[PDB]
Structures are given as C-alpha cells and as structure tokens.
Write an enzyme that holds these catalytic residues in place. Structure first.
Site, PDB file in Angstrom:
ATOM      1  N   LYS B 179       0.870  -1.186   0.000  1.00  0.00           N
ATOM      2  CA  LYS B 179       0.000   0.000   0.000  1.00  0.00           C
ATOM      3  C   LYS B 179       0.899   1.226   0.000  1.00  0.00           C
ATOM      4  CE  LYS B 179      -1.590   2.695   3.098  1.00  0.00           C
ATOM      5  NZ  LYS B 179      -1.679   4.024   2.410  1.00  0.00           N
ATOM      6  N   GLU B 254      11.295   1.747   9.412  1.00  0.00           N
ATOM      7  CA  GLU B 254      12.257   2.786   9.018  1.00  0.00           C
ATOM      8  C   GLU B 254      11.477   4.086   9.273  1.00  0.00           C
ATOM      9  OE1 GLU B 254      15.432   2.431   7.468  1.00  0.00           O
ATOM     10  OE2 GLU B 254      15.526   0.343   6.905  1.00  0.00           O
ATOM     11  N   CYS B 288      14.373  11.126   4.940  1.00  0.00           N
ATOM     12  CA  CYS B 288      14.525  10.420   6.209  1.00  0.00           C
ATOM     13  C   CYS B 288      15.880  10.741   6.814  1.00  0.00           C
ATOM     14  CB  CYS B 288      14.330   8.921   5.809  1.00  0.00           C
ATOM     15  SG  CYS B 288      15.654   8.071   4.920  1.00  0.00           S
ATOM     16  N   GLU B 389      12.091  16.095  14.411  1.00  0.00           N
ATOM     17  CA  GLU B 389      12.226  16.005  12.949  1.00  0.00           C
ATOM     18  C   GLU B 389      11.150  16.859  12.259  1.00  0.00           C
ATOM     19  OE1 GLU B 389      10.808  12.459  10.710  1.00  0.00           O
ATOM     20  OE2 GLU B 389      12.731  12.310   9.710  1.00  0.00           O
TER      21      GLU B 389
END
Ligand code: NA
Ligand code: NA
Ligand code: NA
Ligand code: NA
Lengths: 496, 495, 497, 497
Positions: B179, B254, B288, B389
């Site tokens: 997905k 991750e 990332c 972040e």
C-alpha cells in the site's frame, strides 16, 4: 540444604548486592512439598530503573563494550568453567526450586556449560564486512557493534538454562544487561550472578533484579535507555511486553511456547514412537515450551498406539525429583495446577475423553505436593480448545490422520510454530513432511533436542527472533555502514 | 499523457479492481495544487481479501517453491522494465511528489540497481549445515521465505522505497500486499502494471490503494501476515508495531531521523558548505536522512554560518520539470502547515530564523506548496526545533568545541539513522564515526546509500535493515531440521 | 553449422587484436562423425603465449578491469550470459560439429553455460572481505579480497565451451586478466565466445585466446613468472606436469583431472531407475565425461538381474550423427582416443575380465567413416584390475559386485580418484550413510550427472586440486590481504638509544 | 632449561608410542649461543615416516577423531591451549635454548601460541557447510565440509613451536590425522608439545612426530599416496621441491616460503616511530623472520636523515645470551646459516653496495664462541642487485630511496616475493592507497610485525600458496562435498528400450 546457607538473598545492581528499595521480600517454595525453602528480596520499579541506568553508564564507559572480543570470549569461557565446577550444587538447586528430576537438572547444567562455551568461542569470529562499493573512490564497510543495553526476562520452567541463552551472547558481544528471573524461581539465577561476580566484570555490566513482573516488567520493557528486550514466557505477557517496547521503537526478541506436533506414521518404529511420545508429553511434567502435547497418529495404528501409550502412562513414577526412581515431578505452583485442572473441564465439555489421568494423585507421599497425573486425552479434533491451546502440563491429546497431506494440514493448524517431530522409517517421507511444517525446529525420529550450535525459536505466535547459534548472537549486534569518500568533490547543485 | 493510460484501480489476486465501496481519491500535484488523477480508495475488506489471496498463493507453492534461480530471473526482468520505462517513471514521480526531474532520474537508476542486486542474490544462500554435538545426528538450517508480507511505503520517494521492499520479498519467494502513501500512488500503480507484464502467480503480488487510517490496521494486525514492513512517521510506526504484537508478527520499521552533519574546522570548507546545502535541501528536506542538524566547530562557526546563509538566499525554487529548479515544493498543505508551526516554536524557544522561514511570494510560486529554505541559528540541544524532525527545508546550526562535544551532541537525540563527519583528518573522522549511534555514517560525503549495504536505524529511527544481505534476511525464516540417524529408545518412563 | 563457419574467426586474440600465429602455422580441425576437415585455425607459438601473458599483466596493473566496480563487472558478465542465450542455436550446432555429441546434449550445455555466466554475474558484487575484531587495542583489522591477478586457463576437448565458462565467468567477475587455450582439437566454440566477449567490451589485454598444441605453449602458460593462477582441466599426466611447472614460480594451481566414478546400486534401489541411470552414467557423450559412471558397483543379490538388464539395453543404443534426432550416442573424439579405448579392451581380456557386449568399432555403413566405438559392458572384473582402476574415458563400464554396505564403500573408495559418484537405494537413510563415507567431491542420491553453478565441483585425491563453480569456485580467483592499521602508534623502544 | 631437558623425550612419536629411529641413529642438538651440544634425539628413517603416514591413514579411516563431534574436538584443542599457558615458563626457556632468541621474545611466542590454539578451539564447531537452493526442482543440495584427511606438516627452525601451532591447531580442530616433522636442528619444543598432546589424549595414529633430516624423510612426507595435504613452511628451494613431489599424487599443498618484505617510509611519517620500527623490522630474532623488514624504502627527501639515524642506533644494539635480560639480539641459528649470511656480504660489495655498519662477526669475548653476526645496514643499493632481490634471513637491511608514492609501490612490488610489508605515513589516506596496491598478504599501516590467529597470513607470488591462521587457515584442513538428493526420481528414457 547445605547450599542455601551461603546463597545470597539480594539483588545485584551496579556491582553491589542490595536489598529491595522498600525492604520487601518473597518466600520461595519447593513444589514437591509446598514448603518455604528460601526468602529473597522483592525489588521495586525504581531498583529496575537504577539497574538500567547503571547498565547504560557501563556501556558508555566502554570498559566492556570496547574490550577486545578475544578477551570477552575468555571471560565467557571462565563463566562456563564455573558452571561445570559447580554442576552438582546448581542441579540440586534447580531441582529444589523447580521440582524436576535431578537427571533432568544435570542435563540442563551440561547444556548451560556448552552454551557459555559456544558463545565464548564465537565472540571473536566476525566483526563485519568489507563491501565492494558501487561508487568509485569510496570505501564501504559494515561494522558490527553490541546492540547496547539489554533487558532479559526468563521463565520458571528452566531458569538457569534460559538465562544462559541470553547472558552468553550479551556478554560475548559487549552489551550491558539487566536480568529478572521468574519471581517464583530465582535460586540458580542468584547463584550464577555470584559466579559471574567471581569472574569479574566492570561495574554495571551485569545486573540482577528480583521480583514480580507486575511490579518491574513495564520498566524493563518500556525504558528509553534499553536497546533490546529479550523475553521468554507466556504469550499474553509477551504481547504486552512488545506493545511496551514499541513506545521507544525498541528491538524485541520473544520465545512464547507452542502447540507442538508429534507426528507418528504407521511405518514408524512403533516402540520408539511410544517411548518418544511419553518423553515428548511428560518430561518436566509437560512444562516445556516445546513439549509434544499434540500427538498426530496415522489412523491405521491409532488404536494400537492409544492402548500402548495409555498402558505406559499408568506406570509413570511420580515423586520427589531428588529420589532416583522418580520419573515425573510436580507442577510448579498452585495457580498453574489450577489452570491445568480448568483445562480438564474444558476438554470434557467439548466432547473429548480423558482416557487416563486428569486429576491429582491420592498417594500419601504426593498429597502435600503440587502433583498432577500424566494424562491422555482422546476423541478430540482440531476445532477444540484442548487441541488448540497450550496447557503446559502433563497432558497430551491424540488425533488421527489418514494421509501425509492431512498430517501436515493438522500439524500446521494452530497459531503456534515452535517445534515438532516426524516419526517414520521412510526418511524421504519424513524429510518431505519436515519441509512443509511451519516450525522453527523439526526433529526426524527424535523429540526434544536443542543445542547452542543451532538457532531455536518460533514461527507465527511462538515468537520473534532466535536464540542460540550465530543467529542468536546477531540479536545482540547492530550493523553500521561506514562509507568514506576518498576523493570528495563538490556536487554544485545549489546556486553560488 | 502518461496518465491517460495509467490504471486507476487496486490490483488484488490477479485482477485490477475498484474499491469494494466504489470510493475514489483525487491525487494532487504539489507544484500547483491541481488534481491530476483519480484512483480507487479501498476498504479494509479489500485489504483483507488481498492478504487472504497472498496466503493462498503462498501455500500453493507456485512462487514460494519456484527455484531461487528462476525467482532471480523474474526479479531481473522487473529491473529491466524499470530501465525500459525510466523516462515515464521519472516524470510520474516528479508530477506526484514535486521533486526535480533530475532527482527522479537518479531514483530510477537506483531502482534498477536495487532490483538487479536482489535478482543476483536470490540463489546465493539456502542455509547451513551444522556440525551437531549429538553423535549420529544430522543438523541443518534451511532458510525459507518468511511467508506473507505487508509493505507500507512513504510519500517522499514512493517507487524507491517500494523497490527496497518488493525486490527481496519476490527474490525470497514471499507473497506480498503493498500500500503506497495515499497521496502518492502513481509510480506504484505503474510498477504493478510492469510486474504483471513480467508474470507472477495469482495472489503473489497485490496492491491496495487508500488511507492508512482505513486499511493500515488490517495490514499490520492480520493473523495471516508473517512480516509487516513499514517506512514512514514515528507515531504511525509505533502504532503499527503495537498492532503487529497482536499476532506476534515480525516488524521492520524505518522512521526517519535527526541526522547530524558534523563539520570540523579542518574540513574542506567549500566542500562542507556544498554538502550542508545538499544535506539540508534536497527534496525540500523531506528525506529520512536529511542533514537537518548541523554541528560546526566553534572556530569556523561564524565563517560557516555567513557562507551557508549567503548560499541559501540563492537556492532556486520552482517546478520540478523546469531544469533550472534546485528545490521544489513540499508535499501537502498539511505538511507545509506543520513546517510553519515549527517556525513559531523555534522563535518562542529563543532561536533565530537567520534566513527563510516563510512561504515565498513570487508569482509563479504562489499557487504551489512552497516553503523557503531556512537556517535556524542560536539554538541548543534542549530545544524542540533541534530535537524534533521537521522534515522540511530547514536546518539548525549548533557549535561545538571538541571532538568529544561533537559526539555528545550528535548522539543527543532519540534518533539514529544517518549522519556525516567532514574533516581532512581521516583518523579523526573514523574515531567520530565509530562513536556515533547511527546506521550509516558518511566520511566526507552526505546522502549515499546503495543496494549492496544495509540501511536502517539505531534507537527510535527503526527496527531492522533494508538493502544488502541483511535486508534480504528480513524476508527469510530459519528452520532447524535435526535427523537422528540411529534412533534409540530413551527408556526413561517405566515399562 | 557449416554456414556458421563462413563467419567464424580463424585467429588467436591477443591484446585486443585478432592475430595469426607468429610463424603462420595452422591446424586443421576435424568433425569426428566423418573425419572431414571442417576448419583451419592458427597454431600459435610459445612467443605468442608469452606476449598474451605480458599483455594480461599490463592490463591487470593498469586497473581498468581490476579496479572497475564489482557491480559493473557483474553487468558485463551478465551481458556475456545474454549473448550465449541469443546465440544458443548456432553455438549448440558448432559444439556438436566439433565434438560429435548429440545436438540435444549441446542445447543442454548452452542452457547451462548461460546459467553459469548469470550465476557469477550475480555473485560479483556480493563480498569484498571482512572486518576483523582485532585482539590488539587501537588497531583496525580488515581482510580485503582482491582478484588473484593474471590467470592461465587450459580447457579440455569433451565440453569445450562449458569448461571454458567455468573458468572465464569467475575470472571476469573478480577482476582478473586471463589467457585461455582450448584443446587443440576443439577450438570452435571458444573462438566464438571470444568474439562475443569482444562485443561486450573489455579493456585491452583483459582477455586473451591462444590456439595451439599443449606441447608447444603449455609450458609457458604454466611456468611463466607473471602468472598468479594456472587453472587446468584435462588428463592426469598432463595435469601433474603442469603442477610441476607451476612450482617453479610457486604459482597457485587449480586442477580437474577426471575420475573413476562409482555408481553404487543396492538391492533396494528402484531397479528400472538404476538401469536407466547406469546407461546415462556410462554412455552420455560416449562416456567422455570426467564424471562418467564407469565403475558400476551392484549388490551381489541383484548382480545377475542387473547385468542382464543393462546388457539388453546396451544392445539397443542408437549410434549415429549428433545432428540426427534419433541418435543416442555419437562418436569418440579422435583417432588417438579411439585407439586408446581399443587398447584397453585387450588389457581387460588379458586380466581375465569378460567383454559382455560391445568392445569394438561398429561396421554399419553410415558409421564406417566416423570415429565410432560400440557401447561396452565389462563383467567378471575386480578391483585389482587395470580396467577397473584406470580411467578409459570412453563408452565403457565395468561391473563389480558387493555383499554389504561396508564392502560397497570400501570398493568405491579403492581408486586413486575422487570426483563424483552415485548411490541408488529407496532407503534414503542408507544412501545418506554411504554418501557421507565416499571420498568424492559430489555424491548423487538416486541420480547421476547433475552439476550446477550454485554448488562447487572438484575432486578428492588424484581427481584434482581446488574447486570450480559456486562460491568456492569464485574464491580460486581471489586473494586475501590483511590490512592492519595502528591507530595510536607507539615506539616499542626495544633497541637501545 | 637444562633441568627441563632431564625429563624431555628423545624419541619420535608414532602410532601412540614413543619410539627410537628404526636404524637407531641419533642427532645432537646445539645451543647457538655457545655451540654446545645440549640434547640428543632420534634421527628417523624414511620407513619411520611411511609407518607414521600409514598409521595416520588407519586412524583417519577408523573415524575415532574424524567422526568425533566438532564441539568435543574443540574442547581437546582448548585443553592443549591451557597446557601451553600452564607450561609457559619452561616452554619459553626451551625455545630460547634451542633457537637463541631472547627470553622476552619467547614469552611473547608462548602467549601467541596459547591464543592460536584457543582461537581454533573456538572455531571448531562453527561451520559444517551450506544448504544450497538447488536449481533443479525436487532435489536437495547441500555442501558438507569434511576434514581434508591425512596431513603432513613440516616446520622451520626460526619459531618452531609457533609455526607448529599454526598447523596442529586447525588440523586437530577439523578432525584430520597428522604427521609432523620439525626442523632437524630445533626439535625441542615440538617434542614437548607432543608430550602435552598425549596428556590431553587423541586416538592412536591421529598425531605423529617424526624427527630427522628433510633430506632423508622429506620425500616420503611430500610424495606419499596416502597424504591429502602437504603443509610446509621453510626455504623457497625446498618448498618448490616439495610441491613438485606433491604433484606425483595431485596432493593439495600449502606453502609459506618467506619474503623480501618492504618497509616504506614517507617523509610525512612520524620519524622517530619509523626509526624505531625499522630497527624492529630488521633485527628481531636477528632478522630470521619470514616477514622481517629487510628492504627499507625511504623517501629521497629524508633518506640521508634516516640512514644516519638508523646507523647510529644499529651501533648501540646489545648482543648477547637470550637468557640475559639486557640482550636485545641473540645469535643466528647455525654455522651453515651464518656462513650463508657472510657470503651475502661479499655479494653486496661486489655489486657495488656499501656496508654502512656491521657485516661481520663480533669480536667481543663473550660472543666469540657463539653464532653471532653483527646487525648490518647496506646502503647505495638498487633493485637490480642480488642483495636487494634475495632473502638473506639475517640481521641485515638494505636501504633504497624513492621519489614518489608511485615509485615506492613500483619498487616494493619489484621482487619475486609477496608476504608482508609496512607503510609509514601520518597521511592515512596515502598509506591506504599504497596498501591497496602492494602485492602482499599482510600490510601494516604505521606498524611492523603484527600477526594474530584471527586473521589469515600468507604470501602472494613466490612467498607461498594458501593461508595459515583465521577462517581461511582452517579451510586448508577441510574439503567440500556436494551431496545432491533427487527427491522425486524419474527415468530419463534417453537410451532406447
Ligand atoms: Na512471530
Ligand atoms: Na530501534
Ligand atoms: Na588432490
Ligand atoms: Na604463490
């Protein structure tokens, strides 16, 4: 016992034997007679936190984590040697605490020695890899480092054995650890901490918390300074531990038991299959993560097999684990015996037959202990709770199958995936079946073997990860890719 | 024009199908906020049907029992289709995500190499023979496909992250359900069309399209799944792991990072400035591993800040399809608003917005989701702007005095994905690299990753690894088969 | 295939150029089916071989291939693989024309060759070496795997391109430079593969092809100081000579020298399977297979039944042209080889063995001009005999009986060889026990002949040194270097100041 | 140590028994410090060596050691390691008595030997082979690693017990049977380790010790048909002869033959560190080290400074008895070896080189009776000279200059050898570039001499074949077998019915 007179009653935190922060204690019982045999500290969540922080401080100091791998291996080997030195006393202590026979305890001590020796030898054998980089003028390497601070929670069935599977690789790789044994069976774990202290490790590298999982388990699985949570125990507790570990995205390793099939074909060595069905079902009163509680027997020999098994079950010798004639000891606690008893009610209500056993024995020398008769349940099917659920007691179910395909389908029809066996003189057939079973370990014409050289763990709901072998060591390592650009040039993408 | 032939449906059990409730979603181009395509918006029942099809296909053995060599040939065929369609795929990725066309071409070249690497690895293991400690026994460890895998990918690099998951799953013989991010499905639909052309057994591959809030729970919590592999935000990842616990399911995560870019006073200065810009602003910082946390040695900090700020003012914003563009828009209105809210936080904490920190007001940028490249100075490790972040075109700059302080600051975050050390003293750079708790450390570089080496995070940046041999291992399970070649009765229990 | 020959090179390939022999010498290549000259190629000199080795060295030192990325080297090896598949038909035809084996056998070889190249292409970038946890504080220890260097490669006449692929693929994948010399009598497909490799493109000197007599250039290829590995597949006596030559420069050697391969059949084998596989083992490529099942060991209880069944089938084997679809067995390779096989028949009889069937050249009109030899079964023999101990490498099998599992193992291991063998029994546990005790590089349980790029192949004892194929095969083409860096160096101060 | 000798065996150890030579011959062993006879041992015959090899074969085939569990084999190797540590003092003294090196050097060897045995003890049970994903449907493919078989092991006189440990440890760990012959002039610690191994306990014939002249028993040890691996460490000419003999049975060989090891010093090296390490490289064990840094390559810019500093230090080196704490360098090993070193001095001068310091026997009274040779520095030499190209294996270094990094690499690689070398520079990037280009089995960056059981050691080119130590060292003692099982066998039906 002579041994208990010198055994520590305390936790071991940051290089010191210490009481609980609240001075609480817990009485430890011998399941053979329900007598209190020892009293130990019952630690607090603050004690567990202090231990974790000490482990972190020790890790960052580098005294163990930056020690040479070769030297770490020599220290792990020294632990192994202490186990052998104290084999008799450790086995006796394990039998006193857990109820299993001395012979079973001796086998555990031999295995524990070998686990420490295996990991001692593996410590300095693999530091990472050199990679042939696809980028010209670069050097690429993968370095393996200790994962960091690890928390380790062990079960009551094989306390010191399961402790060794965790301690050995953690120490070999340079990690710091905090271990908590089952609240009801801490004796051998206390003793091994005494022996490790004798070997000598930097302060904070090893820590022992004693107490209720309900009191300290959440800190051990949810603390932000933990890098890996390694738990062996019940499925519901394991799932809770993993959900806790998620709060800090912490690595988890879980070993949670199974519904392990023992598949007996009509061309099996029949007397071998009977012998091994008894061994699978009743060693340690069936309190084994890999116990062969689910017997699947080919229809053609099912009646012969049931009659032979039942006749043997009636002869199993119950008693004190210290007595040479005893073949099966008591179960671990009143609560556990009650759980096994409740499963007998469930089996009957579902329409299964209690062919033999299914109750506490009446004999005078067994009345004060936590005994439960070895039991065979017949006339059952895969839809039943007694077949699907792990009882973890001296109980087996027997189901028939017609074909090899049906044996595989039934064996795989559970939520679990830990271990199982196939008995047949047709080795080709046994190998075909083994390749189709969704189990971490499959035995062909045997039941129970495990050893440090090979990984152990489960598919499906039996766990996450592996213990033992090279894969077991890897749970305690983390990979780092270091890429050096040996001719660095400006990219000049952004305007100047 | 590519869009005129692209499928608008999910792919379940060998068929292109609409959502069970016929719902749809409009896909937007972040450059101009225009609707560019409309796709099915699937239900949790569609996801469940895909998982059950994957399980059925797995048990049939058509792919799981295919030879490893043949599986590798099929994976190689996918690699070759990626290269064949490089142009169209790059353009679709830029249309959907906003990043520059040149960045998208680089992704397509990498994706070809990821598939090719895993194609080549497919038949190179199988397991181990063990020297058993029990006489008259044979011990072997067989590696089998893990089973049924669910794969959830992010919006920043949709096809690249998809390839890191698809390639090893197929190489090992797993069945998969993927997905993509609900807002960026285009290249993932296209790759499914290409995989269908290669040819795989029915149920081996499945594509679900829809909201993570609608189908994510079933993808992570279903009893028939053996591994959940998720790349995305930390809060969603934690939830996915809690769901996976319901069935004791393997997880691979991750989750991004607060990645340090450590610049010593003996770095090649112009290289360090160039790489600080690259670390901070490629894909508008929506990486990332973006170098959002710059740590610069005190003796060159002032020189560095002045140089960086002066360059940031010159960064060219625009349409990713225009060759002069250096930085495109951010992905969505919600994401831009989040970045904006961080600017307020930074100022309230006492940091300085040295440059940027707002939406640009140039006519050709007004309709798009642009945010100016930004440098935040006069900040410290205690601040939310340094710890959290932002995932936008924003960097912070902190000073450090010594090598020990650089390491302490760099490791003072909850994350552990990637980072860099810049210094002409390679010995020093190596000492620092060994002490950083990061899955990847670059010495005199920023951003490199490749299929040959594992990628992933320490601490809250993830669990597990993607790429390399370790990435393939996530898709395998070990089975110890122990044969007693001279079985004897134990005779423990009385006769 | 005769049309294919109109475009095939006739020359050696040295330092990026197709060149004739330095002395213009040539050699006529023959088709063993009819003994007709089908092609003429250059017959190189020892100076040509020396020039090729020096070019390989120069190329290796330049780094153009040896320092190319492993991923790129793998892509180039994959390109060779794809050319083999593209040209499968022509290559198969050329191999049958040159060596005489059936076209169906040649197609199987070409499929395998594609897979060998593809396997090594995929392996090229999967290592690089290891990081070692050093026992010395303040040091970094790593083992880097480099290409071994310059390699000389000498291949046999039975499966020319297949054996060439086993050597070329890992050499190129690792970054070595190579000099290859095919059998003087079967150079055709090797010349073709060099044409295909040139199309892919490699740096000048990385690949070189010498054509000619082992007696003329073999000493330079095995004895030159600039060679790092000599890889030879062929006869035992030549291999021993090569190894002695290699010793002059302490050069690594890899040898594959054939075998006396046992085919062990128990009384509980699937009998018709065992008969089928005994035929396959003995007679594919007229028994000219390093791993041919020339030594049948059959349980005494079924020995008579087995011999009768085998003999009856051997009588039906169809001999003929490898291009004809009905042919089951082609001719042997050369007059000299056929004469050697014939001489063994005399030796067998003089020792007291029985030629149960075959043992002569066939008379049939369509076989009279070719190098045919009848499929042969030798019975009433024992381990003391030369016919049992020595490799004939022809369409000949011996049959010995054994009483027990222990005797089967003892007899099977009673030879100087150790390449491959099989065990046939429905009792898989027994077959596994026997396999563990056989001193052989490959043991098949209920099969005969399988080999593949994923697994190493080679011999114990006099069958060879080293392995080809698999990860171990790649390792023959690598050398390890331990680089140890002292990150905090201190004076030792042992010697006085 | 002279008291230790009163209990040491004087005999060979064959098939579980301490035995004299078949012809009762003996050999006197000498202490090089004073040339006095210190012990007398059996001098075995070729028939003794043959009997040992046959016993090793019988033991191997019995399976008592070869089929023992790997875990148990590791425990026994660990037991040897622990005995070495237990007897560290006596063993170190015996080694200094027999070989002349300093007691401190011998203590370091004993610590290393303990670690070698311990490393292999721990490695014994960590492999076993691989499962292969077969490309043939309905087959199982596995690679089993077995002990190679019977191994012969021949060790040198410089570090007798250390080199013995490198061979014994992996041989026993893997399950081989072995026959070892130490240098005829230095058998003492090897006899002692055999006593210690006997205490641990191995099956009869698993371990055997032959004592004697290589000229008498070497041919049997390298040329016997029952040997599977010949492992030799020693001189190049002997090694080549051994390899040629091994070829007679296509026997695996492992050779370590010394080197011409470069010590490369850049103008940006830590200068005092480079001077210290040049002395260490040149003069530990009087330069009688396979990896001695005999070939110093120094950047031209600092060559004069370096030569003057090195020469001044060489003059201060303390020669004497290895048992005396102040001694820095002992004597060389034998009269014959000292004469060989002396002959090289004549060669150097005749070629036009300068003997800058040393180059003769010392005159001092306490050194006159021993086999001493002064530490020597040879200058004004070049790569074309025999003194630069040939291994002297004595307390002698040559010094050559280089201008650039490229020239340093070219000169360092301009020899027939390839064992070890060093690069000294504070520019680690440069040192790494140079290390990657040196054709050497081990390269030290800012160090000289380190080796350890965790990493493989061995040479490129004429320095050897194969590796000792590490996982690769263990692999020399293993053989791979591919067992392929067809789990659904079908008739091929190629041959007519
Ligand atoms: Na699981
Ligand atoms: Na983590
Ligand atoms: Na051999
Ligand atoms: Na060599």
């Amino acid at each position: 016992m002579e041994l208990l007179k010198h055994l520590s009653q305390r936790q071991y935190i940051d290089g010191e034997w210490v009481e609980s922060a609240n001075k609480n204690t817990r009485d430890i019982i011998n399941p053979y007679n329900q007598e209190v045999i020892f009293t130990v500290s019952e630690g607090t969540k603050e004690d567990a936190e202090r231990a974790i922080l000490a482990a972190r401080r020790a890790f960052e100091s580098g005294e163990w984590s930056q020690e040479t791998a070769e030297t770490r291996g020599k220290k792990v080997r020294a632990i192994a040697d202490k186990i052998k030195e104290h084999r008799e006393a450790l086995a006796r202590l394990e039998t006193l605490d857990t109820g299993k026979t001395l012979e079973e305890s001796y086998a555990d001590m031999d295995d524990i020695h070998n686990v420490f020796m295996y990991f001692a030898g593996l410590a300095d054998k693999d530091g990472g890899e050199m990679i042939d980089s696809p980028i010209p003028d670069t050097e690429s390497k993968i370095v393996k480092e200790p994962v960091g601070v690890v928390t380790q929670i062990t079960p009551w069935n094989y306390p010191l054995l399961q402790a060794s599977w965790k301690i050995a690789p953690a120490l070999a790789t340079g990690c710091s650890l905090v271990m908590k044994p089952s609240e009801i069976t801490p004796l051998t774990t206390i003793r091994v901490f005494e022996l490790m202290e004798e070997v000598g490790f930097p302060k904070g590298t090893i820590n022992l918390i004693l107490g209720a999982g309900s009191e300290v388990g959440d800190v051990m699985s949810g603390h932000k300074e933990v890098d890996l949570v390694s738990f062996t125990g019940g499925i519901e507790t394991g799932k809770h531990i993993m959900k806790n570990a998620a709060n800090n995205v912490t690595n988890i390793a879980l070993e949670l038991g199974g519904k392990n099939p023992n598949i007996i074909f009509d061309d099996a060595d029949f007397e071998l299959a009977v012998d091994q069905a008894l061994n699978g079902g009743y060693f340690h009163a069936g309190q084994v993560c890999s116990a062969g509680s689910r017997i699947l027997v080919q229809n053609s020999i099912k009646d012969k097999f049931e009659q032979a098994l039942i006749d043997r079950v009636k002869k199993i010798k119950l008693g004190n684990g210290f007595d040479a004639d005893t073949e099966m000891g008591p179960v671990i606690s009143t609560e556990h015996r009650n759980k096994i008893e409740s499963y007998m009610d469930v089996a009957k209500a579902e329409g299964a037959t209690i062919a033999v056993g299914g109750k506490r024995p009446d004999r005078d020398d067994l009345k004060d202990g936590l005994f439960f008769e070895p039991t065979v349940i017949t006339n059952c099917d895969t839809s039943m709770r007694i077949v699907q659920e792990e009882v973890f007691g001296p109980v087996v179910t027997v189901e028939g199958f017609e074909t090899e395909q049906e044996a595989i389908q039934l064996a795989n029809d559970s939520i679990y995936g830990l271990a199982g066996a196939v008995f047949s003189k047709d080795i080709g057939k046994a190998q075909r079946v083994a390749n189709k079973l969704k189990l971490g370990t499959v035995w062909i014409n045997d039941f129970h073997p495990y050893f440090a050289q090979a990984p152990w763990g489960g598919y499906k709901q039996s766990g996450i990860g592996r213990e033992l072998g090279k894969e077991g060591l890897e749970e305690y390592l983390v990979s780092k890719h270091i890429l050096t650009n040996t001719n660095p040039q400006l990219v000049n993408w952004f305007s100047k």
